[PDB]
Symmetry: C3
Subunit: 114 residues, 3 copies
């Protein structure tokens, strides 16, 4: 799986250990080994949410399976909780796009996961 967060929060406000924490929490939440979890944080962005430039985050989680109605609700509680706690972004200023990827449409290690 792959989690990306884009945010206007400054680089200095991203805690040491944030990428590791996301990796571990996502490994546990998706039930996949941490070796397959990729995380990407992009601070200092020029963005707005509802016309305001207060802290916000625009995010995506891609996974081959483990994406669905209840699971996505659970990921959203988890990830909004982490963004609130670690980056001080209000949950109602977070968007997360979830993508259930077909294995044939994910490239890795010179091939795909098909």
């Amino acid at each position: 799986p792959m989690f990306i967060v884009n945010t206007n929060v400054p680089r200095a406000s991203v805690p040491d250990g944030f990428l590791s924490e996301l990796t571990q929490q996502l490994a546990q939440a998706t039930g996949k080994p941490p070796q397959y979890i990729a995380v990407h944080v992009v601070p200092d962005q020029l963005m707005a949410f509802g016309g305001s430039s207060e802290p916000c985050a625009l995010c995506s989680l891609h996974s081959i399976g483990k994406i669905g109605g209840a699971q996505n609700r659970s990921y959203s509680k988890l990830l909004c909780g982490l963004l609130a706690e670690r980056l001080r972004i209000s949950p109602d200023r977070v968007y997360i796009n979830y993508y259930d990827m077909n294995a044939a449409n994910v490239g890795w290690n010179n091939s795909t996961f098909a």
Copy 2:
């Protein structure tokens, strides 16, 4: 909705009011309430379009519905027009990917929109 534009145009060439104009005009075009519209501009990017590094843009628009043949043509005209007038980017050097997201696959405020 979520609108993102990545461009090789320098930050200094992005005018004051650009995120606000995007927010307002997308609210107009999509019908969506402006308080739920998020916008993101990423200048100074290392990119080429057709092998050339003249000004260009790669964009996305994600929305729960309001995506379709006619609506996307309307959005493209609006958005290319905005990038041409505001960023001096030729419309034939812009790509916009449109995504009709299932409400269950959009996280917000500790849950999803389903």
Copy 3:
């Protein structure tokens, strides 16, 4: 087609000619004229793959058709080979998400490809 690579490799380790090489090789692989190929490289990113900060890349390839099992395997071998040779990224530290875009869902030059 549009190809995006996000990487923690620093800008100075991206060799001159890289965007043109991606442009030309993707034109050949997809059987599409290079005028249609857009490429975007984003170095210096804060990212981890498997909880490690060793060089890695998170990429996407969007195309209107020419996406599928065998094609995506071929694209992956091509693109991992390029990232390994040029950016010194191990192939098993690369994810490429493939998207088969519907012509109606790609904006360009004030309209869409529909």
